[PDB]
Design an enzyme around this catalytic site. Sequence first.
Site, PDB file in Angstrom:
ATOM      1  N   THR B  86      49.689  68.021  45.443  1.00 48.99           N
ATOM      2  CA  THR B  86      48.830  67.144  44.375  1.00 48.99           C
ATOM      3  C   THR B  86      48.552  65.392  45.442  1.00 48.99           C
ATOM      4  O   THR B  86      47.806  65.237  45.637  1.00 48.99           O
ATOM      5  CB  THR B  86      49.216  66.987  42.752  1.00 48.99           C
ATOM      6  OG1 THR B  86      49.811  66.042  42.820  1.00 48.99           O
ATOM      7  CG2 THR B  86      49.399  68.548  42.397  1.00 48.99           C
ATOM      8  N   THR B  87      49.605  65.360  45.546  1.00 49.87           N
ATOM      9  CA  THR B  87      49.241  64.028  46.977  1.00 49.87           C
ATOM     10  C   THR B  87      49.034  64.135  47.773  1.00 49.87           C
ATOM     11  O   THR B  87      48.373  63.463  48.334  1.00 49.87           O
ATOM     12  CB  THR B  87      51.210  62.820  46.740  1.00 49.87           C
ATOM     13  OG1 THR B  87      51.686  63.213  45.118  1.00 49.87           O
ATOM     14  CG2 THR B  87      50.994  61.574  46.822  1.00 49.87           C
ATOM     15  N   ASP B 294      70.203  70.427  42.576  1.00 49.54           N
ATOM     16  CA  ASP B 294      69.336  70.208  43.478  1.00 49.54           C
ATOM     17  C   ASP B 294      68.864  70.879  45.202  1.00 49.54           C
ATOM     18  O   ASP B 294      68.543  71.882  45.020  1.00 49.54           O
ATOM     19  CB  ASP B 294      68.907  68.512  43.703  1.00 49.54           C
ATOM     20  CG  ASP B 294      67.533  68.554  44.072  1.00 49.54           C
ATOM     21  OD1 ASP B 294      66.806  68.791  43.560  1.00 49.54           O
ATOM     22  OD2 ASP B 294      68.089  67.551  45.197  1.00 49.54           O
TER      23      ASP B 294
HETATM   24  N1  LIG Z   1      63.542  67.481  52.295  1.00 49.29           N
HETATM   25  C1  LIG Z   1      62.144  66.539  53.364  1.00 49.29           C
HETATM   26  N2  LIG Z   1      62.272  66.239  54.928  1.00 49.29           N
HETATM   27  C2  LIG Z   1      61.013  66.179  55.310  1.00 49.29           C
HETATM   28  N3  LIG Z   1      59.650  66.225  54.643  1.00 49.29           N
HETATM   29  C3  LIG Z   1      59.514  65.736  53.170  1.00 49.29           C
HETATM   30  C4  LIG Z   1      60.998  66.352  52.937  1.00 49.29           C
HETATM   31  N4  LIG Z   1      60.762  66.790  51.761  1.00 49.29           N
HETATM   32  C5  LIG Z   1      59.524  66.660  50.929  1.00 49.29           C
HETATM   33  N5  LIG Z   1      59.100  66.380  52.244  1.00 49.29           N
HETATM   34  C6  LIG Z   1      57.957  65.951  52.750  1.00 49.29           C
HETATM   35  O1  LIG Z   1      57.281  65.545  51.417  1.00 49.29           O
HETATM   36  C7  LIG Z   1      55.593  65.196  50.964  1.00 49.29           C
HETATM   37  C8  LIG Z   1      55.223  66.705  49.786  1.00 49.29           C
HETATM   38  O2  LIG Z   1      56.096  66.735  48.925  1.00 49.29           O
HETATM   39  P1  LIG Z   1      55.841  66.828  47.430  1.00 49.29           P
HETATM   40  O3  LIG Z   1      56.277  65.720  46.546  1.00 49.29           O
HETATM   41  O4  LIG Z   1      56.860  67.990  47.418  1.00 49.29           O
HETATM   42  O5  LIG Z   1      54.539  67.246  47.524  1.00 49.29           O
HETATM   43  P2  LIG Z   1      53.424  65.754  46.522  1.00 49.29           P
HETATM   44  O6  LIG Z   1      54.023  64.543  47.081  1.00 49.29           O
HETATM   45  O7  LIG Z   1      52.214  66.036  47.166  1.00 49.29           O
HETATM   46  O8  LIG Z   1      54.193  66.210  45.018  1.00 49.29           O
HETATM   47  C9  LIG Z   1      55.638  66.833  51.396  1.00 49.29           C
HETATM   48  O9  LIG Z   1      54.237  67.001  52.517  1.00 49.29           O
HETATM   49  C10 LIG Z   1      56.453  67.531  52.937  1.00 49.29           C
HETATM   50  O10 LIG Z   1      56.294  66.644  53.894  1.00 49.29           O
END
Ligand SMILES: Nc1ncnc2c1ncn2[C@@H]1O[C@H](COP(=O)(O)OP(=O)(O)O)[C@@H](O)[C@H]1O
Lengths: 519, 433, 523
Positions: B86-87, B294
């Site tokens: 969603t972000t 996790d």
């Molecule tokens: N371990 C990781 N390494 C690199 N990028 C990450 C990792 N975990 C999440 N991301 C990046 O963070 C972004 C947001 O992830 P997430 O929090 O699941 O979605 P949102 O931010 O929309 O809630 C994703 O686009 C992803 O590319």
Amino acid sequence: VILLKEGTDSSQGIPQLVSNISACQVIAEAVRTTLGPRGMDKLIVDGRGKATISNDGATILKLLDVVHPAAKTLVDIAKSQDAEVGDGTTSVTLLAAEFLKQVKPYVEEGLHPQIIIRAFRTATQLAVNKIKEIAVTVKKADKVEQRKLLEKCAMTALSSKLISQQKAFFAKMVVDAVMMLDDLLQLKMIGIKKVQGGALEDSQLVAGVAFKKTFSYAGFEMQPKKYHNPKIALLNVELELKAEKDNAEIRVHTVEDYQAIVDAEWNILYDKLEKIHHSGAKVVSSKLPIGDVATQYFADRDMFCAGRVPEEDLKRTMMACGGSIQTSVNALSADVLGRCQVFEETQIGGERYNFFTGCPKAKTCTFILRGGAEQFMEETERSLHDAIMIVRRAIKNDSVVAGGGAIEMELSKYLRDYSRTIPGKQQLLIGAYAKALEIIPRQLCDNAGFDATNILNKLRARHAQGGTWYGVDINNEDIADNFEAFVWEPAMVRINALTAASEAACLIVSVDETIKNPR
Amino acid sequence: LSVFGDRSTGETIRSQNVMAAASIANIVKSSLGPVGLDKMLVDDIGDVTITNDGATILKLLEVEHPAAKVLCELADLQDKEVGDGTTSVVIIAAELLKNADELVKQKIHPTSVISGYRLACKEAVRYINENLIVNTCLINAAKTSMIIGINGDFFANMVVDAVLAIKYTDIRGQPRYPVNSVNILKAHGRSQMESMLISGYALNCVVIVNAKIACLDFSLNVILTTGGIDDMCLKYFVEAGAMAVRRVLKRDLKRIAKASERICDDELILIKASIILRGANDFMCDEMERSLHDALCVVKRVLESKSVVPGGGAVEAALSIYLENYATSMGSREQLAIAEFARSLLVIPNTLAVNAAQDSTDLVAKLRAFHNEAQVNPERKNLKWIGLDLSNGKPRDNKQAGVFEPTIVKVKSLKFATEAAITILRIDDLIKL
Amino acid sequence: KAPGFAQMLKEGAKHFSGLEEAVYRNIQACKELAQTTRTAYGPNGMNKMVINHLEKLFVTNDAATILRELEVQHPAAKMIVMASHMQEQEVGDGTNFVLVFAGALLELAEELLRIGLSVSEVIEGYEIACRKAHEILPNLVCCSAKNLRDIDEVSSLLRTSIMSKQYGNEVFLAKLIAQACVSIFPDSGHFNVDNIRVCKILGSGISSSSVLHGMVFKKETEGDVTSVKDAKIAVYSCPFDGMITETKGTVLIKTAEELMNFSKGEENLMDAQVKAIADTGANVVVTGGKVADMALHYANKYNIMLVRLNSKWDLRRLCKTVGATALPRLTPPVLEEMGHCDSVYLSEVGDTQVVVFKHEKEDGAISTIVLRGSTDNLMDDIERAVDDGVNTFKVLTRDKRLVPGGGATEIELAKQITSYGETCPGLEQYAIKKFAEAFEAIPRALAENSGVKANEVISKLYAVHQEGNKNVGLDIEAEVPAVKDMLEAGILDTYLGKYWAIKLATNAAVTVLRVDQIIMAKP
Ligand SMILES: Nc1ncnc2c1ncn2[C@@H]1O[C@H](COP(=O)(O)OP(=O)(O)O)[C@@H](O)[C@H]1O
Ligand SMILES: Nc1ncnc2c1ncn2[C@@H]1O[C@H](COP(=O)(O)OP(=O)(O)O)[C@@H](O)[C@H]1O
Ligand SMILES: Nc1ncnc2c1ncn2[C@@H]1O[C@H](COP(=O)(O)OP(=O)(O)O)[C@@H](O)[C@H]1O
């Protein structure tokens, strides 16, 4: 109280560069619409109140005289472009500001100015190497005579103009006028004169020097005009009866002395008249007017004389007849007298016109125009001047590239594809450098009334497919191969434009502070 | 004109909806990624709520604007349908509206912009489906996500056995990986290396090789009673010798029903997965508990959602190059729309790079260079499928590092972001009563 | 009317009270002076859009040129400017060092005064750390000039001075400046930067320049004489024309007869005056103004080599070199006011005729670098880089000691000064430790101007210097924040440049700290 500046104005940092970038765009806006042959004009007025109307980017910038110093740098770069090329001042000023416009938000985002310079110096060198790669030499293409291709170049530049139907006739004479000169070609050597009334076909192609010949004094039915080897006199002396310059006001108290005073005042004109005949000048061409009495003198002595010649035509005759201008008449001798094979008075259009032919130093000519108005001949004066430059530059340099923004889109393609394979901050900058090249074909569409969006997008697709010469067609609202259309420009001119454009943007981008000594 | 309200149109109204959508993105821009910064939410009362989850912010955020409310309803649809992304959807949509508003200033009609975004989203999903990876390093997968990292293969080898033991169809040959099946505990036995895997349920209760496991809920050998056992009834079980226990938790019996030692201060009744973490002190082993749960779920999301895709901005960097080349093939006023769609995707690796305290212009450029070399030729010298290292601040092949996401997230996030930008960009008037 | 003004009692001079911290205002003025010149540091220095007092636009990156046009009015800032003017004496470089370093001391001193340290304790600590710096700096001397007068040796050292004043032309200028300097080092104890007179001509570019002996001047010989070894030389700033006496001399021309006579009188006057030149045996004359056409005939009549130098400063060089003075009247035949020269002749170089004054018989130490350039602005900036290059080796006529560059010395010198600050107990450790951090402002500016993160560069330098890897400086690169060895790269500074700069920068800051209230006075 004890202040450091004390009225001294000074600012530095990002606000200074952004301030200079906006000023550079103001200079481009004054010459943005003048790009192209069909570009909009600009009216400029001085303290005298006279208006100057022309779409010449070089002449416009000389008249503005902007006080902002970042603008002075761009205007100064145009002067170096004139000495280097003679044209391309609008492209350099318009394209330099486009580099500044695209790197403006990156400067605001904290990107250092020095990192921007490394991209311009890099992308410019990569572009110059691509110009020399794409540039093609055309001397004997398909064993066609060079006079044929040169006419196709002038016809395309003059197409969709006032002489559109008779462009072939004007195409031949433009090439023939350039062919009449020597190896050291020059645009200033050829003159263009206007003759009111008549059809376009009646426009004459004079081989030598000519002038309007506003001389309208007495002395007709005499002065045999034809001469096989006359001696042309170049003077600026007034031989009027009661001349504003030469007079004799001697007050006396004797009747007998007045007969000599009236004759002495006459002797000043006669002695000057005899000194011209003393050296043997068959043709007397003076800058100032000449009186009716002086016309009768040379008319009896089998000699021609006609004043009211402009200074330019005399100096153009100075290089043609092979003599020199002599304001006086006492020291007139062979060192300033000229020579020609045929000097004859012609009545083209009913008015009298004098011209020389076959002089020893005949490095010039003249183009007479015939049209239904003066503006048809004033526009045709410069419209043919563009074709004369095109024919001149093709003879000088045979290595050329497709005009109409065709090379600007290939360099935009090469630099954009090269920037993708460049990890670092140079990627977004070289890509911005590529996108800045698209302003040249974008304004050729806007200035021509076409939709720049539809053409520039269709044009970018044809360049991705393999079109290395497609560009903008000022006549038809469509994409056309400017190389096949014989719309060419030299490769060195485009190189010196990018070098002068990048050098101007780098010099403005490298500036951080403006210092002002109060004095 | 005489009316009981107001009316307004022009470029300012599209820009007002663009400047409004951009404000919602900036509210959840810095909180993107695992290293996202926390943000306060001050209610009208005066209380304060602090969190870094972008989805939680949008649900609790209140902004009086119609265009902003579209993005709030947008996040709810993506949440209920998938529950992630969603972000990025709100940030990608705001960038498309920013670039779209710039095109409209260049005399590009919105219908031409909308027709391009519908094409760029379509081909982007085709390019995504062409470069997926299906369910198939499971020791290196959880290693990257995982103080427990001092012994990588030791703790991680127990995770791959836990996530594999829970493999079970349970619906029509679906097999998923249930969540509440592992029972992680801790201890302080003589080292941090004595942690052991258990292939059975660890029941935290107190009082045999009898196969009979009695399951009853009513209140009065492996006999379980949730309703409790009276004092006298325990005496009868001693006669037969049953290992009967009283006051059995409801949640334990559900796992014991689905399923069917000397531990410090709470001896567990083992039925013969779970991992008991023997540590040194409570500080070390307690963090290892959550650290296992996790990274175990990250491996779970990969093996569940069988189709995945590299994360870390690898998708957005590749689409930025393909859509830029595909744009030149179409023409017809769709180049600038599709080309601006490409730049909008770079906000995700640009936003994550800033949050990781790195030069985003360098990493995004380094990220596009490897992906561009992949499209030039298929040779192996050209790097392929590269992402971003948020810890070290450099590129990283997420195929080996184990950084993935479900394919439906990256696919639907572009469809929702494109539908929202189209919904806001189609507006050309404001009428008040 | 009460309440009165706090401390304002002397000619209305603003006396900032104790809460207002009068010392802080002087620090701010000196702090602002550095920020103008901090960006002009190194090869990546940002140029300044300077507007001369004559409303002339010049673009440059020289520090001394900025302060000349930037009318500094705050006297606290004038102390650092006067230190820069003293930095120009005994060395021709390090001007930005005095500005950037002194501002760093004043910037860090304000941090100490805010803590509560006295102004005298900060002064005593800086003077102590300056002494430790002069003791640590000789130990940093890694290599020195081989003392061979070779163009290869000299060109290698001049690369660092010419760089940071004119980038890109580092290779050509290092060789061109070397050819003019090596020709005088044989004159032991007589090398002068004043002997190398730079003359600039509008031309193609810097690459078209060359080096020549003697006093070269672009204006060709007006006469028809090629070469003459006549030592009798006389400069006449008055233009050659019809002579007029300082008395009345009223010439009344009424008729054309009297016109031609007095017009012929001018012919007799110039012929009579030019005859007086040959009577003394002075076959070499230099004109300051124009030249009459009849004088050209008389110049060739008596076979006098006539030269036209329209610039005044071109004549002053001759007045101070050979001794021929510029008199106000038309050719005063005064042999006493004449000069001496062993050889004079015209020469054609680069399709341009230039006059030459050299010394064949005498030893001679004069030379000239004929610069060529398309833009006078960029060509005038190259002149200032030549003076910084020539003056670099005028210092090497003294003890030939070099040190690393690129901020390598500033971190190695800061590392060692911080050690003594930790051992030295008392309140002096604060000012000594901050004196070491004042050296960090140099590579911080050198890194900022290169588009590099400053803190990332200082961390790498302190890391490798902790490993004993001296000679490690900043790698000039827009994208690469790494470092490299400056010695192998050939980047080297002068020992006396850092010595006199550290000495004058410390005294410049101490003189500002000692001041606490600026007062106006009426005579
Ligand atoms: N371990 C990781 N390494 C690199 N990028 C990450 C990792 N975990 C999440 N991301 C990046 O963070 C972004 C947001 O992830 P997430 O929090 O699941 O979605 P949102 O931010 O929309 O809630 C994703 O686009 C992803 O590319
Ligand atoms: N016949 C033509 N068809 C298409 N483009 C042209 C034609 N003639 C000139 N141009 C374009 O107009 C631009 C400006 O040309 P010109 O006026 O000669 O220089 P400037 O505008 O700098 O004075 C060039 O870049 C060229 O590509
Ligand atoms: N090409 C270069 N690479 C690395 N460091 C350089 C380079 N050029 C100059 N420097 C550094 O910049 C400093 C200032 O040089 P310079 O401009 O000659 O003196 P100032 O800045 O005082 O006028 C020197 O101490 C030198 O170490």
